[PDB]
């Protein structure tokens, strides 16, 4: 079970090495700033590896956050 929204589906034909595409990348960050698990991006093992490096370049450029803050508690 446990199969809600898998992020690969809810997106189109995107490039994974593109570190400037904030609006596509930020879909793989959590509500906090965290890189999401595979069981939640629904990527392949090799796919996740690349997104993982791409997201980090995006953070260095200030386009994606390193961390954020939970708004309910």
């Amino acid at each position: 079970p446990s199969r809600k929204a898998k992020v690969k589906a809810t997106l189109g034909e995107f490039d994974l090495r593109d570190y400037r595409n904030v609006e596509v990348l930020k879909r793989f960050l959590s509500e906090t700033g965290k890189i999401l698990p595979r069981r939640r991006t629904g990527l392949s093992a090799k796919e996740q590896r690349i997104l993982a490096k791409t997201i980090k370049r995006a953070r260095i450029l200030g386009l994606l956050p390193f961390t954020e803050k939970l708004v309910r508690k």
């Binding site: 034909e13 995107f14 994974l16 090495r17 200030g62 386009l63």
Partner: protein, 101 residues
């Protein structure tokens, strides 16, 4: 000669005259280091996900260059020497890798 990509974040707060001066020093810095400049795109300024240099924005640049490998670290060194150059990121270029396509 390898093909790179030079990212430069810029002081979002300077005007036409201090910008046009920076871009000058940037393309002269390139010239002196072997940078043959293929395609470029001044995407401008966007909202940073986190304040850099206490600004909440940053003016962006991007060059795709062929240049001597042995000279890249100095090129990036020289580029960071400036004060409105907040970040330099020099990646070597890659064939894109589609997904979900």
């Amino acid at each position: 000669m390898r093909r790179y990509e030079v990212n430069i974040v810029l002081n979002p707060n300077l005007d036409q005259s201090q910008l046009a001066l920076e871009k000058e020093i940037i393309q002269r810095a390139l010239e002196n280091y072997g940078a043959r400049v293929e395609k470029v795109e001044e995407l401008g300024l966007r909202r940073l996900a986190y304040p850099i240099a206490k600004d909440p924005q940053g003016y962006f640049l991007w060059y795709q260059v062929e240049m001597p490998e042995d000279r890249v670290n100095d090129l990036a060194r020289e580029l960071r020497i400036r004060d409105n150059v907040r970040r330099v990121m020099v990646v070597k270029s890659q064939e894109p890798f589609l997904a979900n396509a």
